Amino acid sequence: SHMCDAFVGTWKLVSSENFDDYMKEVGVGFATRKVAGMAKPNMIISVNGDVITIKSESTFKNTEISFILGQEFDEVTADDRKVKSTITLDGGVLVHVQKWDGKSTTIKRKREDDKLVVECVMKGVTSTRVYERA
Ligand SMILES: CCc1c(-c2cccc(OC)c2)[nH]c(=S)n(C)c1=O
C-alpha cells in the first residue's frame, strides 16, 4: 500500500461552487464556460508503481493525465490550455500547479470523510468541487 490509495477509484461530481467565476479568472471564454459548467464529470484515479493516472470523463470532454509526483509534464486541459503541470503530495493533499502564458493556477485534491474535495484557485478566486464514490 501507499498513502495515494485513498484517492484511487471512480468518483462522480456531486456539487460545485463558484466554478464559473474560477473559469472567468482563468480566461475561459463564454461558450466553454457555459458547456463546461453543465458537466458532471467522473474522475477515475489509479496508480501503477510510481505512475498516477487521473482520467476525467464528461459529456463535454474527456481528459487523461499520467504523471510521477514532483516531475513536470505537458497537459492539455479540458478548456484547451496547453499548460506545464507539476503534481506533488503535501501532507496528504495532491497539489497540482498548472503554468501557461505567465499565469498559474493550483488545484488541490483531498479526502474528506467519504468525499474527494477539489479546490481550484486562480489569484483570489476559489472554486470547490465535491466528488463522491461512483
Ligand atoms: C476545467 C477542467 C476541470 C474540470 C472539468 C470541468 C468540466 C468538464 C470536465 O470534463 C473532464 C472537467 N473539473 C475540475 S474538478 N477541474 C479541477 C478542472 O480543472
- CATH code, 126: 2.40.128.20
For the chain, after which residues does the C atom lie more than 2.5 Å from the next written residue's N, i.e. where is it broken?
none
Q: Quick one: which H or E segment has residue 22?
A: helix 19-26
What range does the domain containing 120 cover? 3-133
Grid coordinates 472567468 are at which residue? 24
What total of structural domains would you count in the chain? 1
Give the separation between CA 51 and CA 68, rounded to whole angstroms.
5
Residue nearest to atom 18 of ligand 1 (CA): 78
Grid coordinates 489509479 are at which residue? 46
C-alpha cell of residue 53: 493516472
Resolution for this model in angstroms, one decimal place? 1.1
Residue 28 Cβ inside 6 Å of ligand 1? The answer reads: no
> Residue 15 in 3-state DSSP?
strand
> Residue 84 in 3-state DSSP?
strand
Give the separation between CA 50 and CA 71, rounded to whole angstroms.
11
22 is in an annotated binding site: no
Give the separation between CA 28 and CA 80, rounded to whole angstroms.
9
Triad 12, 18, 19: Cα angle to 5°: 55
| Inter-residue contact 94 to 83 (CB < 8 Å) | no
83 is in an annotated binding site: no
